[PDB]
């Protein structure tokens, strides 16, 4: 189906404790495949998935230099935002970036991204047109004016329409065994009495890839969104993900509840119930 490539950058200042640490990690869909950490004893771009290991020395050398220079750029940016937001040298601050592209089944560009945050809040983002910017505030507008003057968006567009899609296509082919395999959820419902009058029904989904999934409870065929406890989808550590959804039901009314599961790996949505 459709696929994504994403690079996630995190730079964090630590006044009194050296220079800001830089981390870059790369993903295809929900699979991480590269990392770089400036705090590593010997910082280097390193493989984190089997299908990227075949990339030659030039790949690792270039990406390492790129992350080394990026480390310095984010340190400059952290100093800059202290000025733009009139902040002291005392506090720790964070810059984040998300960059990448989505492609469809045929590998054509669906859209590109280049967006930044400061201390967890939107700072500046490339719009979907890949030609204009959204600045969150008057500080980010200073960056926007600077980036407009230098025609940064044009260069972003070039990367996103070329390099980004080209390499995503390559990774998808080289990792087709895993990147192009959906693992459906293994499902079951558990039942736990809470008291003489109430019981918990918990609907489980395990071992699925990718992470996107829909898990819902219905009572007499009606969605129980408000009364459902839904945990965040979580990694199992073996590439797969897990999720559950729980409802508190009146004792004796268990069979009026149905769990519904949708996932890319399922030909048709699943309906399941408590089965004693």
């Amino acid at each position: 189906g459709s696929h994504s490539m994403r690079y996630f950058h995190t730079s964090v200042s630590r006044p009194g404790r050296g220079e800001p640490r830089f981390i870059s990690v790369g993903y295809v869909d929900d699979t991480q495949f590269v990392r770089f950490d400036s705090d590593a004893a010997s910082p280097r771009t390193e493989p984190r998935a089997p299908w990227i290991e075949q990339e030659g020395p030039e790949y690792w050398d270039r990406e390492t230099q790129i992350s080394k220079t990026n480390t310095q750029t984010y340190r400059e940016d952290l100093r800059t935002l202290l000025r733009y937001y009139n902040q002291s040298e005392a506090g720790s601050h964070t810059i984040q970036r998300m960059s990448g592209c989505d492609v469809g089944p045929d590998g054509r560009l669906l859209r590109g991204y280049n967006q930044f945050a400061y201390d967890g809040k939107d700072y500046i983002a490339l719009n979907e047109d890949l030609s204009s910017w959204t600045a969150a505030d008057t500080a980010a507008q200073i960056t926007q004016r600077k980036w407009e003057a230098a025609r940064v968006a044009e260069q972003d567009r070039a990367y996103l329409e070329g390099t980004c899609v080209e390499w995503l296509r390559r990774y998808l082919e080289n990792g087709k065994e895993t990147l192009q395999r959906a693992d459906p959820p293994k499902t079951h419902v558990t039942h736990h009495p809470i008291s003489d009058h109430e019981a918990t029904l918990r609907c489980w989904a395990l071992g699925f890839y990718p992470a996107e999934i829909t898990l819902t409870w219905q009572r007499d065929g009606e969605d129980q969104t408000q009364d459902t406890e839904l945990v965040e989808t979580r990694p199992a550590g073996d590439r797969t993900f897990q999720k559950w959804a729980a409802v508190v039901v009146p004792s004796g009314e268990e069979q009026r509840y149905t769990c519904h599961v949708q996932h890319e790996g399922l030909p048709k949505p699943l309906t399941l119930r408590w089965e004693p």
Binding site: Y59, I66, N70, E76, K146, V152, T163, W167
Partner: peptide, 9 residues
């Protein structure tokens, strides 16, 4: 593959 940052803030 990721490229250099294009320009500082």
């Amino acid at each position: 593959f990721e490229d250099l940052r294009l320009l500082s803030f």
